[PDB]
Amino acid sequence: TRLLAISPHLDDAVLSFGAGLAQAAQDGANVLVYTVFAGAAQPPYSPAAQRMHTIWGLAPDDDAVLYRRKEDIAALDHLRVAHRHGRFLDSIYRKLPDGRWLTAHVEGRQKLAVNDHSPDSDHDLVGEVADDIRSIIDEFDPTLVVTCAAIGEHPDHEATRDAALFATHEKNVPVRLWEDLPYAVFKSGAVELPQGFRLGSADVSSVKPEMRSQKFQAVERYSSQMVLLNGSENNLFDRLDEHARQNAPHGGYGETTWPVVRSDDS
């Protein structure tokens, strides 16, 4: 088994699929977690990025990508799986064709806004990510690819998912999507896939308590993300446990994944 997990950001694969990854490794699978939006960023940073850096417990002008890459390596090391850090800039570092930042902070609004931009610029990014994923598929030769469902609709998650769908379709490798966590705790779960693709029936895994423990410990390696993920209740792991319990009231911990298959008449 050669399992390629494609994470949009430095944390998503561990949060959503860390128990699956750890179990795969223990079972003897060759596991590689490739993060798309791990590209190096350097000042000057936008006000919005500087705001995020502060929330992440860094100085505004710190090399946040470096800090997060080190966290990712620590977390994946904990799960005993390999990492690969991609070249694409997180949405907080990207610019529009016109020179404006992609993401902006709006005074008095907690949620960051995305500036409108061309259909072409979106298509081009997905195309580039798909190119890189096709190259990794050639290099790693996975028997299975898993990436995010993009529940929560983060643009980076949607770009990752779509590019993975295109690349795996072209290369004829099976693909599954994980339920994005913690997003799925506060979203409906329904997603809109690119034309021609649809989800098959869900699998809800049953993971041994040791795997849950190992996942949760790995999550804690993402120090920069903890305050943000824990919320005003300090209850990330409680919420993840409850979500798992909902989906398997007769079980222990688990993670929901769906196969992606071709739609009828496509």
Ligand X SMILES: CCCCCCCCCC(=O)O
Q: By CB under 6 A, tell whether 53 contacts ligand X.
A: no
* Listed ranges 4-12, 165-173, 188-196, 243-251: which one lies at the site for ligand X (CB under 6 A): 4-12
Three-state DSSP class for residue 217: helix
Q: By CB under 5 A, tell whether 12 contacts Zn ion.
A: yes
Residue 154 beta carbon to Zn ion: minimum distance, rounded to whole angstroms: 6
- Out of 41, 112, 144, 248, name the contact with ligand X by CB under 6 A: 112
Q: Name the binding residues for Zn(2+).
A: 9, 12, 83, 90, 117, 122, 156-157, 179, 243
**Dihedral of the alpha carbons of 34, 36, 41, 45, in degrees to the nearest 10:** -140
**Cα gap 257→244, rounded to integer Å:** 12
> Which is nearer to ligand X, 3 or 65 (by Cβ)?
65
Is residue 16 within 8 Å of residue 148, measured between CB atoms?
Answer: yes
Residue 18 beta carbon to ligand X: minimum distance, rounded to whole angstroms: 13
The number of residues that bind ligand X (CB under 6 A) is 8
**Cα gap 179→198, rounded to integer Å:** 15
Is residue 29 within 8 Å of residue 153, measured between CB atoms?
Answer: no
User: Which residue from 143, 139, 8, 17 is spatially nearest to 79, judged by alpha carbons?
Assistant: 17
Is residue 155 within 8 Å of residue 114, measured between CB atoms?
Answer: yes
Q: By CB under 6 A, tell whether 9 contacts ligand X.
A: yes
User: Which residue from 134, 37, 26, 130 is spatially nearest to 84, judged by alpha carbons?
Assistant: 37
Q: Find which of Zn ion, ligand X, none residue 91 binds, CB within 5 to 8 Å per kind.
A: ligand X
Residue facing ligand X at closest CB distance: 9
- Out of 4, 5, 92, 240, name the contact with ligand X by CB under 6 A: 92
Please name the residue that has the structure tokens 């997905």: 126
Q: Which residues in this chain contact ligand X in the complex, by CB under 6 A?
A: 9, 11-12, 90-92, 103, 112
Q: Which residues in this chain contact Zn ion in the complex, by CB under 5 A?
A: 8-9, 12
